[PDB]
């Protein structure tokens, strides 16, 4: 299928406050994907493997 390269997530998500201002956590990840695409004779558009 497709091959993915990804970076590790956050080390931990410590709990914060509660009620209105609940615990807030932020995470960021990097992703790389390799696939194939196909197109027809008039060449108006092309579609990747995952369906984009």
């Amino acid at each position: 299928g497709v091959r993915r390269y990804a970076s590790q997530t956050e080390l931990y998500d410590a709990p914060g406050r509660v009620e209105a201002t609940y615990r807030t956590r932020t995470t960021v990840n990097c992703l790389i994907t390799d696939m194939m695409a196909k197109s027809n004779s008039p060449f108006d558009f092309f579609v990747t493997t995952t369906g984009q």
């Binding site: 299928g1 497709v2 196909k38 197109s39 027809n40 092309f46 579609v47 493997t49 995952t50 369906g51």
Partner: peptide
């Protein structure tokens, strides 16, 4: 066929 049904659903 341009749309690969097997690829779309398996990955999803």
């Amino acid at each position: 066929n341009v749309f690969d049904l097997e690829g779309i659903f398996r990955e999803y």
